């Protein structure tokens, strides 16, 4: 195992509404595997700071989540850094544009309807609703517990931007949200819980 760190996914610029959620994704690889560090305006991102949380996900992914987005503070460059003790560190960065009030780019995604909390009996199927519009039309994806829902799962599909889960199992319990992603912006729905009862 002898390789220098490589960024295989760069962070992308985001536009978010104030009070919103924003996230940046980074991924890298090397031999041996790099750590990824997140920087704001060149300053490593605080363990303390309540609004930022960093999620490390297998496949080499690192995610920086900012919730709730603050209009002054959060308008900055977030850079992700990868090091493994071989060669040079590799870094990539992205900006965050924050939109006050309604002064949003035309066609910024809007979520007309959002998921509601539900209890579902084991073995039953549920539909969770996201309704969105934008131009260009938003791609819609679902998150549980801040993690992308895996649509590789046989039991999970999208109907009309709705998330359907068939043959419900306890493991499906979580806090779900829907994201509508646009060239213009990203919108996250309000998180809500899915509970599974027995019997």
| Token pair recorded at residue 70 | 């603050």
| DSSP labels, 130-154 | -EEE-SSPPEEEEEETTEE--TTST
Residue 117 and residue 130: Cα distance in Å, rounded? 13
Fold of 1-101: Immunoglobulin-like (2.60.40)
User: Closest Cα to residue 49, out of 80, 74, 27?
Assistant: 74
The experimental method, as deposited, was X-ray
Structure tokens at 71: 């209009």
Binding site annotation covers 103? no
- Buried b / exposed e over 140-178, threshold 16 CB at 10 Å, is bbbbbebeebeeeeeeeebeebbbebeebeeebbbebbb
Contact between residue 76 and residue 41 where contact means Cβ atoms under 8 Å apart: yes
Tokens of 127: 């539909």
Resolution in A: 2.3
44 assigned to a ligand binding site: yes
φ, ψ at 170 (rounded to 5°)? -60, -35
Provide the β-strand partners of residue 54.
64
Three-state DSSP at 175 gives strand
Q: Would you kindly state where each structural domain of the chain is located, as residue ranges?
A: 1-101, 102-199
Q: Is 116 annotated as a binding residue?
A: no
**Angle formed at CA 52 by CA 51 and CA 55, multiple of 5 degrees:** 135
Residue 41 marked as a ligand binder = yes
190 is in an annotated binding site: no
Q: Are 24 and 63 in contact (CB under 8 A)?
A: yes
171 three-class SS: helix
Is 155 among the annotated ligand-binding positions? no
91, 83 contact by CB (below 8 A): no
Dihedrals phi, psi of 78, to nearest 5 degrees: -110, 120
Residue 81 assigned as binding residue = no
Residue 148 Cα distances to 27, 55, 141, 178, angstroms: 15, 11, 8, 10
Give the number of C-alpha atoms closer than 13 A to the C-alpha of residue 168, restricted to the C-beta side: 23
Residues in the chain followed by a break, C to N above 2.5 angstroms: none
Q: Is 148 annotated as a binding residue?
A: no
Q: Say whether 50 counts as a known binding-site residue.
A: yes
Distance CA 21, CA 189 (A): 9
d(CA 170, CA 167): 10
SS3 call for 170: helix
**What is the Cα–Cα distance from 151 to 10, expressed in whole angstroms?**
22
Instruction: Tell whether residue 51 is among the known ligand binding residues.
Output: yes
Considering only CA atoms, which of 116, 25, 101 is closest in space to residue 63? 25
Does 40 appear as a known binding residue? yes
39 is in an annotated binding site: yes
Same topology between domain 1-101 and domain 102-199:
yes
Determine whether 23 is exposed, middle or buried from the number of CB atoms within 10 Å of its CB (0-12, 13-18, 19+). Answer: buried
Q: Give 68-109 as a 3 state SS string.
A: CCCCCCCCCEEEEEEECCCCCCEEEEEEEEEECCCCCCCCCC
Confirm whether residue 182 is marked as ligand binding: no
Task: Please return the burial class of 37, using the count of CB atoms within 10 Å of its CB with bins 0-12, 13-18 and 19+.
Answer: middle
Task: Give dist(CA 193, CA 68) in Å, integer.
Answer: 19
Q: Tokens for 131, please give them.
A: 């309704």
Domain 102-199 has CATH 2.60.40.10: yes
- List the structure tokens of 49: 């700071």
């Amino acid at each position: 195992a002898a390789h220098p760190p490589e960024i295989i996914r760069k962070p992308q610029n985001q536009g978010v509404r104030v009070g919103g959620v924003a996230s940046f994704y980074c991924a890298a690889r090397g031999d041996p595997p790099p750590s990824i560090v997140w920087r704001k305006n060149g300053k490593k991102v605080s363990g303390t700071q309540s609004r930022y949380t960093v999620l490390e996900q297998p496949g080499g992914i690192s995610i920086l989540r900012i919730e709730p987005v603050r209009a002054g503070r959060d308008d900055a460059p977030y850079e992700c850094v990868a090091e493994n003790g071989v060669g040079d560190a590799v870094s990539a960065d992205a900006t965050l544009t924050i939109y006050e009030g309604d002064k949003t780019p035309a066609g910024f995604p809007v979520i007309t309807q959002g998921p509601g909390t539900r209890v579902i009996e084991v073995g039953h199927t549920v539909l969770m609703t996201c309704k969105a519009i934008g131009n260009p039309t938003p791609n819609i994806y679902w998150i549980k517990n801040q993690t992308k829902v895996d649509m590789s799962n046989p039991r999970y599909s999208l109907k009309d931007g709705f998330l359907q889960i068939e043959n419900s199992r306890e493991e499906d319990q979580g806090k779900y949200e829907c994201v509508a992603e646009n060239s213009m912006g990203t919108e996250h729905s309000k998180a809500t819980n899915l509970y599974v009862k027995v019997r």
